[PDB]
Amino acid sequence: QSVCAGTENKLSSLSDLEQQYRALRKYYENCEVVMGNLEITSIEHNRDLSFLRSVREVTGYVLVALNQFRYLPLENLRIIRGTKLYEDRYALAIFLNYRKDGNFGLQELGLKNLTEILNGGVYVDQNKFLCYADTIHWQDIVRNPWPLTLVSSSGCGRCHKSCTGRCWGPTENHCQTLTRTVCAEQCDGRCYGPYVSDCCHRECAGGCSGPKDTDCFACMNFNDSGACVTQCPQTFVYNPTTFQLEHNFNAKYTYGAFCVKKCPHNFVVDSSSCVRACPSSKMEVEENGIKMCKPCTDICPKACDGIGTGSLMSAQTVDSSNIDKFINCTKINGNLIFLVTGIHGDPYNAIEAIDPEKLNVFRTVREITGFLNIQSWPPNMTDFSVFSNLVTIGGRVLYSGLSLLILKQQGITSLQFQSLKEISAGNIYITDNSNLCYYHTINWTTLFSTINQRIVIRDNRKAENCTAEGMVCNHLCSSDGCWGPGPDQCLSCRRFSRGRICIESCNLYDGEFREFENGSICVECDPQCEKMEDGLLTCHGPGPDNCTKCSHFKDGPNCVEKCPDGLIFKYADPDRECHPCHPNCTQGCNGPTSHDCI
Amino acid sequence: QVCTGTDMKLRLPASPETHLDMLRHLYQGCQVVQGNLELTYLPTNASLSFLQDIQEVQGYVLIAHNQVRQVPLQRLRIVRGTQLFEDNYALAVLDNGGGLRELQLRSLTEILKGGVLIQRNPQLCYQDTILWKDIFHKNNQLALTLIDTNRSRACHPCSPMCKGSRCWGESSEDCQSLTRTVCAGGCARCKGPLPTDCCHEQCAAGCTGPKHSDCLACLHFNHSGICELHCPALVTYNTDTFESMPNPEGRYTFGASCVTACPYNYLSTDVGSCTLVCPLHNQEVTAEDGTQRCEKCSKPCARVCYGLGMEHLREVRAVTSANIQEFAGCKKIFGSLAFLPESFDGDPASNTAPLQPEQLQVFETLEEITGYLYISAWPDSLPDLSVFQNLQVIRGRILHNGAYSLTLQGLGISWLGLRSLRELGSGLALIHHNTHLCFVHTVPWDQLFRNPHQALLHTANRPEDECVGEGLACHQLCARGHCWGPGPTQCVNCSQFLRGQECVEECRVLQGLPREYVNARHCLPCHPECQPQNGSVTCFGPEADQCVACAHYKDPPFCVARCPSIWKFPDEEGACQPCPIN
Amino acid sequence: SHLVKCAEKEKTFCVNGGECFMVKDLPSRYLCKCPNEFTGDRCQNYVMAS
Ligand SMILES: *[C@@H]1O[C@H](CO)[C@@H](O[C@@H]2O[C@H](CO)[C@@H](O[C@@H]3O[C@H](CO[C@H]4O[C@H](CO)[C@@H](O)[C@H](O)[C@@H]4O)[C@@H](O)[C@H](O[C@H]4O[C@H](CO)[C@@H](O)[C@H](O)[C@@H]4O)[C@@H]3O)[C@H](O)[C@H]2NC(C)=O)[C@H](O)[C@H]1NC(C)=O
Ligand SMILES: *[C@@H]1O[C@H](CO)[C@@H](O[C@@H]2O[C@H](CO)[C@@H](O[C@@H]3O[C@H](CO)[C@@H](O)[C@H](O[C@H]4O[C@H](CO)[C@@H](O)[C@H](O)[C@@H]4O)[C@@H]3O)[C@H](O)[C@H]2NC(C)=O)[C@H](O)[C@H]1NC(C)=O
Ligand SMILES: *[C@@H]1O[C@H](CO)[C@@H](O[C@@H]2O[C@H](CO)[C@@H](O[C@@H]3O[C@H](CO[C@H]4O[C@H](CO)[C@@H](O)[C@H](O)[C@@H]4O)[C@@H](O)[C@H](O)[C@@H]3O)[C@H](O)[C@H]2NC(C)=O)[C@H](O)[C@H]1NC(C)=O
Ligand SMILES: *[C@@H]1O[C@H](CO)[C@@H](O[C@@H]2O[C@H](CO)[C@@H](O[C@@H]3O[C@H](CO)[C@@H](O)[C@H](O)[C@@H]3O)[C@H](O)[C@H]2NC(C)=O)[C@H](O)[C@H]1NC(C)=O
Ligand SMILES: *[C@@H]1O[C@H](CO)[C@@H](O[C@@H]2O[C@H](CO)[C@@H](O[C@@H]3O[C@H](CO)[C@@H](O)[C@H](O)[C@@H]3O)[C@H](O)[C@H]2NC(C)=O)[C@H](O)[C@H]1NC(C)=O
Ligand SMILES: *[C@@H]1O[C@H](CO)[C@@H](O[C@@H]2O[C@H](CO)[C@@H](O[C@@H]3O[C@H](CO)[C@@H](O)[C@H](O)[C@@H]3O)[C@H](O)[C@H]2NC(C)=O)[C@H](O)[C@H]1NC(C)=O
Ligand SMILES: *[C@@H]1O[C@H](CO)[C@@H](O[C@@H]2O[C@H](CO)[C@@H](O[C@@H]3O[C@H](CO)[C@@H](O)[C@H](O)[C@@H]3O)[C@H](O)[C@H]2NC(C)=O)[C@H](O)[C@H]1NC(C)=O
Ligand SMILES: *[C@@H]1O[C@H](CO)[C@@H](O[C@@H]2O[C@H](CO)[C@@H](O[C@@H]3O[C@H](CO)[C@@H](O)[C@H](O)[C@@H]3O)[C@H](O)[C@H]2NC(C)=O)[C@H](O)[C@H]1NC(C)=O
Ligand SMILES: *[C@@H]1O[C@H](CO)[C@@H](O[C@@H]2O[C@H](CO)[C@@H](O)[C@H](O)[C@H]2NC(C)=O)[C@H](O)[C@H]1NC(C)=O
Ligand SMILES: *[C@@H]1O[C@H](CO)[C@@H](O[C@@H]2O[C@H](CO)[C@@H](O)[C@H](O)[C@H]2NC(C)=O)[C@H](O)[C@H]1NC(C)=O
Ligand SMILES: *[C@@H]1O[C@H](CO)[C@@H](O)[C@H](O)[C@H]1NC(C)=O
Ligand SMILES: *[C@@H]1O[C@H](CO)[C@@H](O)[C@H](O)[C@H]1NC(C)=O
Ligand SMILES: *[C@@H]1O[C@H](CO)[C@@H](O)[C@H](O)[C@H]1NC(C)=O
């Protein structure tokens, strides 16, 4: 369906006008469905904009401002959903599109297919050379009129004698089609003729070819496999014949305005829908490898707000005023973003720079559900020792195609992400880190969940330069690489380990403490038993049950330093197993027989 | 209001003397009949004015064996046909013969499913004047129609005021109004010959205008006057933030309408609908006082104790010696109970012995029934229903012949018992032909019922004069003579104190009997070690810590039977003190 | 060009070397002109070449 994302710049631009045109091409060329905004600003009058003809729908707003071109080639644009509005008011805004000191500017709109706007108003203002913005019945296009919708040029002429008088241009091929204000009284939606029989389906937005939920030009609410519907088919159907709720077949999962058979692995399954986070009345659980959510019991784990979610919905970066919200957090529900205005302060506002000591609050975070976006870091922090216990990131929200993004940090020489084990979805982008040494050693397919994931590495410190005249991975470290220097920064090791540190051998028969190898990670056995001499094994496994020799007496299967006497009494030998006492012992016990009660 | 229907088909009334009272209580003052509308075996001159309110029937309409000249259903607009008579017909008029003269169904414009069956009605004129194809629905044109021409009355000519001679009766007001066959478009229903007379796709039974608020009847769901295809969901999915969120406009689905909360006996389900049964892997939870909802099992669900009409017992006639053991240890039964002849007698064809009084004791633990309780036979050695004395609630979600939740027919009972019973959730109570039953007239039945359309119907029980002639009356120690039976245990509400489930005048504080301390309506014994002095505190309280005097081994902070083995021993005054050796 | 330079009290609006401009008339609204390395509505973050 050729989906692309909006720019979110508003009126601001690059200072070089040719690069502003080239960026517009890179964002929207060959795209059909725009998520976010369609924003066209400061384009020169000689530039070719015919690449915009493929656009069919815009989810946010359409903004056209300060341009010098004559014509908008948006002949296929049908619907503007308006789920974000310009200045929180306008879904379509067109203004100031002419040169103050010349004859250049916007002359015709070309918007013949534009049939509805679901939310917000229309703003047309000060377009000195624009014809046919007026004479358009904008109340047919806007779904919720407010008798917003401001319209305000001469010498444009009558459209054509054969036209109804509502028109986008200078000929009869540009006449506006009315679809809602010229209808039979019985209709809820829009029409394909003036008769009660040429009325179309209530769930279809911006016009129809026929009366069915298959026969629609664009859909509002959900697209169920080519039919447009109020909600996806559910796991149960109500039976008003019997007052019972009956199990249903063909039930589909709701996912981002589509109905699907399988919910993607990044999202939580809840009541036949895929969600980024579960509501506060319930708890997120995993069963059979599937993420899902069930009612909360006792005290449930809670995730903290990320940048762009919850109480931080308005935040652009971690900064000196919002960083305190992360002090006791173990999971972030949203993105974690570090921009220049957050790290070094924002003098236009009251927010000062972050003291590097404050960043230590993120040492308790194990999961980030959105992407990690690092574009600024304090001048002399040489690594990411903050996040050393971070386990997994991303896959529910991405920045473009990325879950991990590190741009242009010159003070950093190593990463040191000790605990990072998996990235559930999205790509990795690490560039321009001219002093970063270890990056070239990492085997990144061990962190990815699928064969569809990729990593972009370029323009960092040369791998041959740092290898020859710089730092390398520890001698115990495997071919999968290391995050930084030493025995505790390696992704996976040869020999053995204890905690985060890789080692040659595990003190099974030699040392002030004694262990059992237990596969790759070595563990201590119960200290109440003996530590063996002459190179002999101390324990066969964990617990007092697995000791090879005992320095004290015993009970049952194991070595025992103290037996539970005085409970009831129980007798113990100094060098043999403990014995049950004779009945009716009241002061102490010397054994299991009649004279042993003290 | 909304009322339910009988589903008796053509069977004889259980109590012919009270059949008109059953029909008046079920149908008086309601607009919508859920289930069937069944009017059968009515006597000559029966007063039927209470039927004039009905506009909608959700099942079929059955009119059979009646001796009335007319049935006042002229306001009826739509029959939905969600159940059909003999699996084929939505409207059936049978054997009404001195019999029905006219149908008079002036407002009827929709039959959504099934046919029309009219047979053996000698006096019934105007059966073959009606254009039945205008009444059947466009998408459900089964049209199975049987009409009987064998009329004994001479028909009066159809009024000249009726353009098509389509009379339902002799009056100028009896002319059929056509809503399908008179329009040139594809419109399911319309109000005139013009294209502008066509009305909204969701309207049924005709229209007063082109909008979805102009319907005479609603095809799918009536949203508080606005006619709609689905009830608004309680939870809505945000297409852009990928999260479920509450809907401030959301409604529960209930039958063919949308509501903000469901009626008293219905079980609320979290998907946005109200049901008589809970979905698989869910529990019933009384989350708030006076209501109930389904909640999901977080771990594998506990055993559910089923009764008659559900699961493996859904085809079973009655409780018998072959299946009674399945109720062992049950406090709540999901289903109904029925005790019939051949429950308390044998069946040589089923190799099954009769139930004994010692086997009925399996129900001693029972506190709640989800369906109905029907008893038409009972052992002659049991004077009451005391085997059900702990029964608190009969919900009535399933009713005997669609009408009765509590039924007692022809039994040897002297008094009802059932003293724990607090609620009859739904349905009528029917008690008749019990020649020895006395205390049915002293039970506070208006306290057990929970809405309109509920009543006690009774006949042929022991006359009140024969109860008084033998001194059979409520005990004096309880409110206003409200009793379930004779003696101090069968009182509803004691005026003083309750001891061992008996009402009593005195709370044993100063009496020669083993002494008891006072509570709000109850009396409880002193600890035996405490001295029974004449002071109101000295012996008295729920722990020895309240006692002031002690018979022996007195530990200064409280009275005990023996000094505890720090060890203690009794001193020269009989009080406990620490031992020199522990 | 329908734009003027913003006042010294508000020139801090643009970050990362961006220049601050105001629209000639009304409420009023502002824009930044970014260097070729930065984007966003007031030059908050980097341009990516992919
Ligand atoms: C994360 O959020 C918590 C709130 O949940 C914030 O608050 C507490 O912070 C302290 C210090 O960091 C945490 O650790 C403990 O601090 C105690 C300080 O003394 C105060 O608290 C005790 C509470 O009983 C009072 O008696 C006392 O008068 C003071 O008011 C120490 O007492 C604790 O250790 C010592 O005492 C215990 C006593 O059992 C001994 O076992 C120890 O050996 C030792 O001698 C301990 O250091 C504390 O847990 C937090 N409390 C809560 C409610 O959880 C954090 O500041 C906040 N920030 C982060 C990220 O830490
Ligand atoms: C923008 O407005 C245009 C009108 O200016 C609007 O119309 C589309 O026009 C194209 C042709 O330019 C139609 O093309 C279809 O292409 C297929 C495949 O080649 C053909 O099979 C179709 O033609 C036949 O079959 C149709 C079956 O329904 C018949 O209706 C038709 O008479 C032919 O026999 C057809 O040419 C295209 O179908 C229309 N659009 C629609 C919705 O019909 C276009 O919709 C507007 N832009 C957008 C993106 O909505
Ligand atoms: C002492 O050291 C032992 C190794 O030398 C430790 O290992 C063994 O641990 C198990 C318990 O985990 C003991 O009990 C047995 O448990 C298995 C469990 O079955 C499941 O796991 C195995 C793989 O481990 C898998 O093959 C199965 O399909 C199951 O999924 C049971 O099958 C047995 O019946 C039994 O209960 C072992 O006895 C024990 N090993 C030995 C040699 O005893 C042991 O835990 C250490 N500590 C102690 C207290 O013994
Ligand atoms: C409801 O969803 C269905 C998909 O489930 C939509 O149909 C799809 O429409 C897209 C539109 O881009 C089609 O992709 C296009 O295919 C043509 C093939 O010639 C190609 O030239 C375009 O570049 C583009 O890739 C896609 O094939 C089509 N899928 C199917 C199964 O027909 C449909 O439009 C949705 N309806 C509404 C009203 O939203
Ligand atoms: C980077 O890590 C990936 C895993 O994420 C490594 O891929 C693995 O490659 C080995 C062989 O080196 C595969 O094992 C076996 O290889 C033999 C041939 O030597 C073959 O006959 C067996 O059928 C089997 O494939 C292993 O399955 C494969 N894993 C995956 C998930 O594809 C890769 O080698 C690592 N690179 C380095 C140099 O660290
Ligand atoms: C010694 O090493 C063995 C492996 O060679 C360890 O046994 C494994 O222990 C892990 C937990 O550390 C078990 O996995 C987890 O089990 C939970 C059960 O609820 C499950 O939710 C997790 O997804 C995960 O599967 C693993 O099952 C177990 N393996 C076997 C065969 O039992 C053992 O823990 C080590 N002992 C010591 C002292 O460290
Ligand atoms: C949809 O359901 C609503 C109720 O939720 C129905 O509205 C009810 O309309 C009837 C008349 O058809 C009203 O009864 C009349 O009330 C007046 C009150 O002055 C009285 O004078 C009349 O004798 C008669 O009793 C009834 O009050 C009204 N209920 C409410 C709550 O407004 C409506 O008819 C249903 N629509 C369809 C198409 O079935
Ligand atoms: C029937 O049951 C009710 C409880 O449902 C019994 O409790 C209540 O008893 C009091 C006293 O007889 C009734 O009157 C009020 O008593 C308080 C006592 O402090 C007094 O302050 C008030 O001025 C008033 O006299 C009360 O109404 C009653 N409860 C209810 C809900 O009616 C009642 O004793 C039982 N009746 C018999 C005769 O068993
Ligand atoms: C109306 O009465 C006629 C008789 O007057 C019935 O018609 C008879 O039906 C039987 C059925 O076995 C045939 O054998 C006869 O030949 C029929 N007689 C005539 C005169 O046609 C008819 O069934 C009656 N209709 C109803 C609805 O009862
Ligand atoms: C509680 O009161 C009873 C009387 O109701 C007391 O018992 C009486 O004790 C006197 C002692 O001289 C005897 O003469 C009476 O014959 C007793 N009467 C009865 C009914 O037995 C008893 O002593 C009182 N107890 C206390 C703690 O004072
Ligand atoms: C390093 O950063 C700290 C932050 O407190 C600062 O005080 C110090 O002057 C910096 N030193 C250098 C050499 O960058
Ligand atoms: C290796 O990198 C260091 C970084 O300081 C640089 O001085 C040196 O010239 C580099 N050597 C080569 C061969 O590029
Ligand atoms: C019906 O009432 C009429 C008087 O209106 C009377 O003549 C007739 O006997 C009554 N029929 C019966 C069976 O009560």
Numbering used by the authors:
A (entry chain A): 26 to 172, 175 to 179, 183 to 597, 604 to 634
B (entry chain B): 24 to 120, 135 to 602, 613 to 629
C (entry chain C): 177 to 202, 205 to 228
Sentences from the paper on this structure:
The HER2 dimerization arm is stabilized by several polar and Van-der-Waals interactions with the dimerization arm-binding pocket of HER4, which involve two conserved aromatic residues, specifically Y274 and F279 in HER2 that interact with HER4 G286, C304, and R306. The equivalent residues in the HER4 dimerization arm, Y268 and F273, are engaged in reciprocal interactions with the backbone atoms of HER2 G292, C311, and L313 via a network of hydrogen bonds. The HER2/HER4 interface has two salt bridges (HER2 H237 – HER4 D218 and HER2 E265 – HER4 R232) compared to only one in HER2/EGFR and none in HER2/HER3. However, in contrast to the HER4 homodimers, we do not observe continuous density connecting the two heterodimer monomers indicating that glycan-mediated interfaces seen in HER4 homodimers cannot be established in HER2/HER4 heterodimers.
Important cardiovascular functions of HER4 are exerted via heterodimerization with its close homolog and orphan receptor, HER2.
